[PDB]
Design a protein around this nucleic acid. Structure first.
Length: 960
DNA sequence: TACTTTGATTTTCTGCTGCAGGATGAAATCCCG
DNA sequence: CGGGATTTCATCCTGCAGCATCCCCGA
RNA sequence: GGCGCGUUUAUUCCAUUACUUUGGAGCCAGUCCCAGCGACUAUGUCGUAUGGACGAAGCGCUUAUUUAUCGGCCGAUAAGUAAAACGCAUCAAAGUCCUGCAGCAGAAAAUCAAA
């Protein structure tokens, strides 16, 4: 039976247990706080439970709300202070936040710099460089670099990273002493969040220590991203200089006038980035308008400049609160439309004959628009104008007035309907979208007469109307809520937080979470004997740094007006995982509670169809006892192929490489191929289609679809990981993946991020293995991905570009038509090719022989070598498309022997066979020969094909 | 021969992945009943 | 004088190996 | 699309704790009232269920007052109400979180240009 927990139990029973290292694996339990609505849900059951729990009391709710608001305000204040500090002096701050080396690395410094890369801003003295050479565990020598000062107060060892000229290398959350600056009463800093925001009501210790981490973590992350990106920006600047020079030369060679603008130096703020990107945009606009379009020059010969991307913003303080009132903007648009009425009337009425047809060309819909069931407001207004012209003749003076009156009446009706709708309870997004579209159409109609008179005022009007159109269409779907976070630094007597339980029976437990963050509250811990439990008394466990577990009795008062008491809501599965686990018991110390958080975030309520705030509790657990991996030795192989249409296709093989038919398909016949994840893409496309329909109708989709794709993707990833682990454990096999880079995936036009699940599957399988204490190499391995999907599994021949080039070279004409040979096999050049005509938006079918004859109609003796570049290019494009090894995505055809099969299954088998290849002796001789500087892929392909053919002859008997 | 696609830039809103920072207890003073 | 409450401090171990592989192919 | 009942995901032993999701099965989808869109006899008419508003959303099992049939519900058959309690439709899986940025993609609109 395929259960993840069953596989975990089998893994546990098969090996010994050992204590974890300094830090073990971590896992988070996310539960909900028992609120009145959950109780109401519990009271509507057909079979009512015997004991319905009490919800969170009113006093706790008030305390929690106040504390959450105060915590958010203190975070904002501290972040604003450090934003000002960074904006004043970057280098000083990022030198202050750099993490010092441990005060234990006191090996003998050997060599100073052969100097002043940075400076300790505390004393404004340079940090001199000092090296230290050592050997790693793998034998590769490594030199670390450190910065030291002659100040005794600043006699530290700040880590450094060399570049080809030094960087810092690490930013810590605790390097800067936050408590002594902002929390302690002796400090003279003008900003003291606990003393000012909270009104001296919160305990200094816990709240201050939580703020320390919460703010300095974000600051350190921003500093790391900034220092990282400031180097690739330099590389891009240097690269753009050469391209600008080359394009200037090309423009000069063709006798064109290049704009006289200069690229600014490398910027270090957001305004400089915007200026540089504006210059790049102007250059690219000119290049496209004059070089690619008019002269038909290839993009490769005239390469564009590149924008600067990835510059971070300061945390939480640079957010733009684009808060605009909707009806006010509607009124402003109406006002400015009413301003220009006379100018539009004058332009339209006094217009000439033939200029009128071109004046209203953008107002006339196309045939495709008329066919697709619905038209934009512009074309509808154009149809109205045409009918009015037919009605009144050529007297456009009356036409203008009638059109204006009709548009006003329609807009007034829409406005009245929208106001009545929003008065009661309801939102009609379609009506708002229609009103915005009709306002846009009226604005265009009025202002189109100023496109040639005053381009500055016309540009101002266009900018205003464009920004207001964007804002009006985007506001009704703008989210205004944000999560609220309350942190718990740790679970020890210091931080005044407890996770308490009554000992019902011997194993049964009651459950509360207690927070004491207000002055005056009482929460007392008392040490007791290990087995001195009593009824109606709350107990907990305290974990000591030395490995000791101290059971304590926690006593307090329920009616205390300062405490926060939270009852939790969870399921059997979560309880067996964390609270009352059979093996990982937290009373024994095998499981430890690390820290926690109280979260307020939005849940979707379908009863009211709205997002509403809700309270969650997250508790992080650390595993202290893990397994021993020294005895696991898989024997067989499972090659796994990843993709989009099918998330996983797996093939099972013996140690020799021969297929093993042990899986059962739907029909029950033995097989060696399994598919995991089918019909996932179809569901994702269905969700996307629903989203697109709503987006076209109203400009955005409802909150019902907010998290559907992510939930589906998470479900697929977790279930696929379970399936892979189950097969690997039960078949005694090692899993083999392709060596795809992190973040690998297609970045095209109709691509979606929910369909890029390669690294996610990798990470989930690795983490699931890691929680038990085993390394990734125990059950998972990677191999080179080259030529795995391009090798025939029946003959061992791999197709390459050079083969296609040589086939083009040999192709000629006999009395029967075009002919060629590959590896002594004759090819009868015939058959039709159908291509997806994008301009026609259809499928166009052509005949290869006829196309080849046409290409030979302008040529004599059919000499391919005598053709131009473009003609030969079309020739090999046609031959490649007709002789492609992958005519259809899921179908593979071998060109050398005519073998046909499924591409994914063959590639899955070839992945395992390649993993076998990498540890053969042919690869050894190839590696030895490659040391002579011969960097040729051709020899690698030779070795791969030779090994594959040898093994096919020897032991891999092909299917007959 | 031409209508209809495509190239570039700008405005607004949403979601999903990717990568940084993390997953604090021990000990020393100080004050107050 | 003991017990809360507040303040100060400090911790770390990892690769390597070749241009393709869910891209495809295009008026 | 909407409305509800809820099972299985630990072998004696572990909170039918109640959470958040992915599946299976049950029941119900009309009205131009207001808008949107399309065709025109065109400052309106007609049509169209695109969006709001209204309306729809299991079946049995046992208990006692009234009527219809005999001596005038006591004995049974149908109709009308709240509750107690069980059964069938009807069933399998998964969960490692927080903060902060960035990058891609989706959807419209505006302008210039080419073929």
């Amino acid at each position: 039976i395929k259960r993840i927990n069953k596989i975990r139990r089998r893994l546990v029973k098969d090996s010994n247990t050992k204590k974890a290292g300094k830090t073990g694996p971590m896992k988070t339990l996310l539960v909900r706080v028992m609120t009145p609505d959950l109780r109401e849900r519990l009271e509507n059951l057909r079979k009512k439970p015997e004991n319905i729990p009490q919800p969170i009391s009113n006093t706790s709710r008030a305390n929690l709300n106040k504390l959450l608001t105060d915590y958010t305000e203190m975070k904002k204040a501290i972040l604003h202070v450090y934003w000002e500090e960074f904006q004043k002096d970057p280098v000083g701050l990022m030198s202050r936040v750099a993490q010092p080396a441990p005060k234990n690395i006191d090996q003998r410094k050997l060599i100073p710099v052969k100097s002043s890369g940075f400076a300790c801003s505390q004393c404004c003295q340079p940090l001199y460089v000092y090296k230290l050479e050592q050997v790693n565990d793998k034998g590769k020598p490594h030199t670390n670099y450190f910065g030291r000062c002659n100040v005794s107060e600043h006699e530290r060892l700040i880590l450094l990273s060399p570049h080809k000229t030094y960087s810092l290398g690490k930013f810590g959350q605790r390097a800067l002493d936050f408590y002594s600056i902002h929390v302690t009463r002796e400090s003279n800093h003008p900003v003291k969040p606990l003393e000012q925001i909270g009104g001296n009501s919160c305990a200094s210790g816990p709240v201050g220590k939580a703020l320390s981490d919460a703010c300095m973590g974000a600051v350190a992350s921003f500093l790391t991203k900034y220092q990282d990106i400031i180097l690739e920006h330099q590389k891009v600047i240097k690269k753009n200089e050469k391209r600008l020079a080359n394009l200037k030369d090309i423009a000069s060679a063709n006798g064109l006038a290049f704009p006289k603008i200069t690229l600014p130096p490398q910027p270090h703020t957001k305004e400089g980035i915007e200026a540089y990107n504006n210059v790049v945009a102007q250059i690219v606009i000119w290049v496209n308008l004059n070089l690619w379009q008019k002269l038909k020059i290839g993009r490769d010969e005239a390469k564009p400049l590149q924008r600067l991307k990835g510059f971070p913003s300061f945390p939480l303080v640079e957010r733009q609160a684009n808060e605009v009132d909707w009806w006010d903007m509607v009124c402003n648009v109406k006002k400015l439309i009413n301003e220009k009425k006379e100018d539009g009337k004058v332009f339209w009425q006094n217009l000439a004959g033939y200029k009128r047809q071109e004046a209203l060309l953008p107002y006339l819909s196309s045939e495709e628009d008329r066919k697709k069931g619905k038209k934009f407001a512009r074309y509808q207004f154009g149809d109205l104008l045409l009918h009015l012209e037919k009605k009144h003749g050529e007297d456009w003076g009356k036409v203008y007035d009638e059109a204006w009156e009709r548009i006003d009446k329609k807009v007034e009706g829409l406005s009245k309907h929208i106001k009545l709708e929003e008065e009661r309870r309801s939102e009609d997004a379609q009506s708002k979208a229609a009103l915005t579209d009709w306002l846009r159409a009226k604005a265009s109609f009025v202002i189109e007469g100023l496109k040639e008179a005053d381009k500055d005022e016309f540009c101002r009007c266009e900018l205003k109307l464009q920004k207001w159109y964007g804002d009006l269409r985007g506001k009704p779907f703008a989210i205004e809520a944000e999560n609220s976070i309350l942190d718990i630094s740790g679970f020890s007597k210091q931080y005044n937080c407890a996770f308490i339980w009554q000992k019902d029976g011997v194993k049964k437990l009651n459950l509360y979470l207690i927070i004491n963050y207000f002055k005056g509250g009482k929460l007392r811990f008392k040490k007791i004997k290990p087995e001195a439990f009593e009824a109606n008394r709350f107990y907990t466990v305290i974990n000591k740094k030395s490995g000791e577990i101290v059971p304590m009795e926690v006593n307090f008062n329920f009616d205390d007006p300062n405490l926060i008491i939270l009852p939790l809501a969870f399921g059997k599965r979560q309880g067996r995982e964390f609270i009352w686990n059979d093996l990982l018991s937290l009373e024994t110390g095998s499981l430890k509670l690390a820290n926690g958080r109280v979260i307020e975030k939005t849940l979707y309520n379908r009863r009211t169809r709205q997002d509403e705030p809700a309270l969650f509790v997250a508790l992080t657990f650390e595993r202290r006892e893990v397994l021993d991996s020294s005895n696991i030795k898989p024997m067989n192989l499972i090659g796994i192929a990843r993709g989009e249409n099918i998330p996983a296709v797996i093939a099972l093989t013996d140690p020799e490489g021969c297929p093993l038919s042990r899986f059962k398909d739907s029909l029950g016949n033995p097989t060696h191929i399994l598919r995991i994840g089918e019909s996932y893409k179809e569901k994702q496309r269905t969700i996307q289609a629903a989203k697109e329909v709503e987006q076209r109708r109203a400009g955005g989709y409802s909150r019902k679809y907010a998290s559907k794709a992510k939930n589906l993707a998470d479900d697929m990833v977790r279930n696929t990981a379970r399936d892979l682990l189950y097969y690997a454990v039960t078949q005694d096999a090692m899993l083999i993946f392709a060596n795809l880079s992190r973040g690998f995936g297609r970045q095209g036009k109709r691509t979606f991020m929910a369909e890029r699940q390669y690294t996610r599957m990798e990470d989930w399988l690795t983490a699931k293995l890691a929680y038990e204490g085993l390394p990734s190499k125990t059950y998972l391995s990677k191999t080179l991905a080259q030529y795995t999907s391009k090798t025939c599994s029946n003959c061992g021949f791999t197709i390459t570009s050079a083969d296609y080039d040589r086939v083009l070279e040999k192709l000629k004409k006999t009395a029967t038509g075009w002919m060629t040979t590959i590896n002594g096999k004759e090819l009868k050049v015939e058959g039709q090719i159908t291509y997806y005509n994008r301009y026609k938006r259809q499928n166009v079918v052509k005949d290869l022989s006829v196309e080849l004859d046409r290409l030979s109609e302008e040529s004599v003796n059919n000499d391919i070598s005598s053709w131009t570049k473009g003609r030969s290019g079309e020739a090999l494009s046609l031959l490649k498309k007709r002789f492609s090894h992958r005519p259809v995505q899921e179908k593979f055809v071998c060109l050398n022997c005519g073998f046909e099969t499924h591409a994914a299954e063959q590639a899955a088998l070839n992945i395992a066979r390649s993993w076998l290849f990498l540890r053969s002796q042919e690869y050894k001789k190839y590696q030895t020969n490659k040391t002579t500087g011969n960097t040729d892929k051709r020899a690698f392909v030779e070795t791969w094909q030779s090994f594959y053919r040898k093994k096919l002859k020897e032991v891999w008997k092909p299917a007959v």
